[PDB]
Design a protein around this ligand. Structure first.
Ligand code: NA
Ligand code: NA
Lengths: 249, 249
């Protein structure tokens, strides 16, 4: 069985004082065993050392991004080998905000995923379609193209988690149903089965990166092809604990 | 007189161990008084807390970049108010590598400079032309356009330093002379005098962001319109101290 996976993407948020409160809340949290849920928290770069040094050893830390290749003359960028040096085990790559606002191409994201895996990082690789793309009938064309750019550059999937972001439901007034999440997760897993292998499809976590809260986490988590969540805003809040508890039997 | 300014841009380089060695070397350095030189060091985001907590209080820390506006849903980005929270006083904005490789437009850079200044950061604002631009006769057209995008968005220049990067001499086999640096600095200061004010032109540091080393720092530093340096690779090395010492009488 695929181990339920809950990632918390803090995005471009936080102060030393708020990070200390968030970490203190996660440290005091009582959640399902390490055998039933894998928990990853992703602060901004400048708080990665603070979080890694103070967070409970059974929760894991992710960067929100890293550079496409070896460090050097890339002012403003953080290399995968910097994260490895700081004992940061995870990285989020290809988040919808970087694809849309920072114009990260599917090929750029694929190159990042390959380089991060080569340096020993574990990767949350993000995909997802816009409202225009979904309304054009392009959902699986887009998600397959984005996934293919990663798959063409990846030889080992052990350290990959795919996050599906329904960008079409994020800020548009459109709401994704658990059935709509399940449909994309199922079609994406079928795509992995045909284009990579049956093994990789059966063992790769595909997590839901739409609007996740205490109200919807159990119904979403119970979907056959949803293996967990990449949580946004709720990741800064005690409610993140309730979302981790979606793993419980 | 304009206070000589030496910035060290570490770029996408460093490990905890190497940062500790670099900081220990700067802490042991014996350089001209705070009255004659202002020294700024710019590590990657993930090392800003380590450097700020351990670096001598008379040297200052800069981020290599920050986000264009208020933080929030910008996965991978670091806001100016995050840097202010961590007591990081400086930021480098519009570095040639971000303009060229990350496609930061002159308007994007100008917006960043305005937002960073609004949050209380001091800014090293970078400009400079490519070999193609220089060989086309566009040097001052390009540098003026880049500076104008910043100037159109800035009302107070007290906390700005302009860095001229001769991108045309950085990796091309072309070498910039001190006379060539002086010509651009002079034309850029004249531009500030006409387009902003005589006061702003007379008081704004314009630093040279070309190839700077112990061999050339005194001749470059002595130019009438060169007020210091934005150093690259040498900023990781003991040689950075010799470049700071270019301030000496
Ligand atoms: Na499930
Ligand atoms: Na000078």
């Amino acid at each position: 069985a695929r181990k339920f996976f809950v990632g918390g993407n803090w995005k471009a948020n936080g102060t030393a004082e708020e990070v200390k409160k968030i970490v203190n809340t996660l440290n005091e949290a009582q959640v399902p065993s390490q055998d039933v849920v894998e928990v990853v928290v992703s602060p901004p770069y400048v708080f990665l050392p603070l979080v890694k040094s103070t967070l409970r050893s059974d929760f894991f830390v992710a960067a929100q991004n890293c550079w496409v290749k070896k460090g050097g003359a890339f002012t403003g960028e953080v290399s995968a080998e910097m994260l490895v040096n700081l004992d940061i085990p995870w990285v989020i790559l290809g988040h919808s905000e970087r694809r849309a606002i920072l114009n990260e191409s599917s090929e750029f994201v694929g190159d990042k995923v390959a380089y991060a895996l080569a340096q020993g990082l574990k990767v949350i690789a993000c995909v997802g379609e816009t409202l225009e793309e979904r309304e054009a009938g392009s959902t699986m064309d887009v998600v397959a193209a984005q996934t293919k750019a990663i798959a063409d550059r990846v030889t080992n999937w052990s350290n990959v988690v795919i996050a599906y972001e329904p960008v079409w439901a994020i800020g548009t007034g459109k709401v994704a149903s658990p059935a709509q999440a399940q449909e994309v997760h199922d079609e994406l897993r079928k795509w992995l089965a045909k284009n990579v292998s049956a093994d990789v499809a059966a063992t790769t976590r595909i997590i839901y990166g739409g609007s996740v809260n205490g109200g919807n986490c159990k119904e979403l988590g119970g979907q056959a092809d949803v293996d967990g969540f990449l949580v946004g805003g709720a990741s800064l809040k005690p409610e993140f604990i309730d979302i981790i508890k979606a793993a419980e039997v």
